[PDB]
Amino acid sequence: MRCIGISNRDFVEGVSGGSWVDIVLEHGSCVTTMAKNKPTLDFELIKTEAKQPATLRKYCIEAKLTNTTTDSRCPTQGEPSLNEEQDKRFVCKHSMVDRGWGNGCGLFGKGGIVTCAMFTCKKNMKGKVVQPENLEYTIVITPHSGEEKHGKEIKITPQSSITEAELTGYGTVTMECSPRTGLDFNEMVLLQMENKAWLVHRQWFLDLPLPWLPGADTQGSNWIQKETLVTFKNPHAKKQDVVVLGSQEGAMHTALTGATEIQMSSGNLLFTGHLKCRLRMDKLQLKGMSYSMCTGKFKVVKEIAETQHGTIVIRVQYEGDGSPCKIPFEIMDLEKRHVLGRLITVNPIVTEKDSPVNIEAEPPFGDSYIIIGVEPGQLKLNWFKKGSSIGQMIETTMRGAKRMAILGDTAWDFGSLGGVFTSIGKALHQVFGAIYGAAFSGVSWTMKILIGVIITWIGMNSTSLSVSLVLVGVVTLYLGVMVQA
């Protein structure tokens, strides 16, 4: 029920011989599982937690300079040297300065000059790296019980990814994950600013053009390449001065366009990424699936509701006797000829007589009728579904295509049952995605559309090669238009 109302709702149907289905969970999204004779469950990734962060390096973004020094030499005497020149807290640069009799030197020509200033950093941003084994994944397991702590929270660790949830009345659900393949934190770093944090690629973080310290440095004098944060001026080639650049925190913010914001205020809270997990439902049961009918009447307390996924949610109240008892629910036609819909909330049950119960159903396109109870006093509703089968199919195919685009090879594991076709598709798309990543790494989206246009034109103007090229081009165009950055 917790997944009711979220536009990122997904459905998986059927089970294999071992009652195992591969599923994939993303932050902010959740999936709904059901089978022929299994309870309907909701799976949601809510929290990603990293316990042990390690500081990789500290990037300074505001600096101040004091103790400015200057030493000059007459021309043809080399360049001057100062004892702060070795002192690498002091950034130094050598330029050339006009010298002459008016400058107190007996010769005329290009005279040496050097200036040094103490480099002191006011505040900086931290880049934290976490080993993959220090990740914590939180999963809520709420069944479609119809109740108005409803679900069960379980934790996934890379070292112990084997777990099960004890559902009250449903038995036990076994859910084993594999976080080693979800996100490779071995190449990721948790950049942390004054109060905001981003999850960025480690390699892109290392080569940032800022002064930096080793992650273990504490005193603050081991800054590398301070020249990227300070500048030297020779307006008239007569005297050089060094001034500090401005705060780079705004520039850094502009530099994190494609970065994903995370939380590091009260712990390493991550609300990003996916999780491909293996679901086993051998030992699931239905609450009171043996009770008889509710021969009494019913009344709707909250009327028909339409979600973004074509399903209906109904809360109804029972006033007859025999509780607990089964709820007669079925999607019939007007003359009562053929079954038209199916129940998302399989086996609606009245736990307590005065307790309202929420029911879910998926009516077909067109006129749909909800049957509640039995004569006398049977309820019949008159909701109409807006859409068409072709529209549903095409929306499904865009959803699948975008999911493939955004999950890579793991998208085949969203509803894989271990079939050979699924494995072949996964391998082919895996090698294709490896080629694509090795090809279009670190490139803007508009450039992706440009490339797609180029290969589409080439394929159009050049037959197996032509069709392969146009397919690659249209795929690249779809990837470019669908990618956020």
Binding site: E148, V301, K302, R315, D354, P356
Partner: protein, 109 residues
């Protein structure tokens, strides 16, 4: 604020309806309609939240329904212990909470 009658009285064992009226931002737009019972000298206790549904441990005598900008509370079979202060509360659109003026329930002897 929320407008509702100051005092409502009814014979025991009867059915009475009391209404709480607000505006479109809090009552007529949201389902955050809840009713609380305030005993004299005791802490308030919720008797009804999400008027279409009822809380746990509360008798089914209390029933709530919303008609447009007015939310109504109906009690079936008035009894002696029902004499207490009842408040209607709504979570407004602006993110804050608004409460009714308080109602005193009287049961005839």
């Amino acid at each position: 604020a929320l407008t509702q009658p100051a005092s409502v009285s009814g014979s025991p064992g009867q059915s009475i309806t009391i209404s709480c009226t607000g505006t479109s931002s809090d009552v007529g737009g949201f389902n955050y309609v809840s009713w609380f019972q305030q005993h004299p000298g005791k802490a308030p206790k919720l008797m009804l939240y999400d008027v279409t549904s009822r809380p746990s441990g509360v008798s089914s005598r209390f029933s709530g329904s919303k008609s447009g900008n007015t939310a109504s509370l109906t009690i079936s079979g008035l009894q002696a212990e029902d004499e207490a202060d009842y408040y209607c509360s709504s979570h407004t659109s602006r993110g804050t909470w608004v409460f009714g003026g308080g109602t005193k329930l009287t049961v005839l002897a």
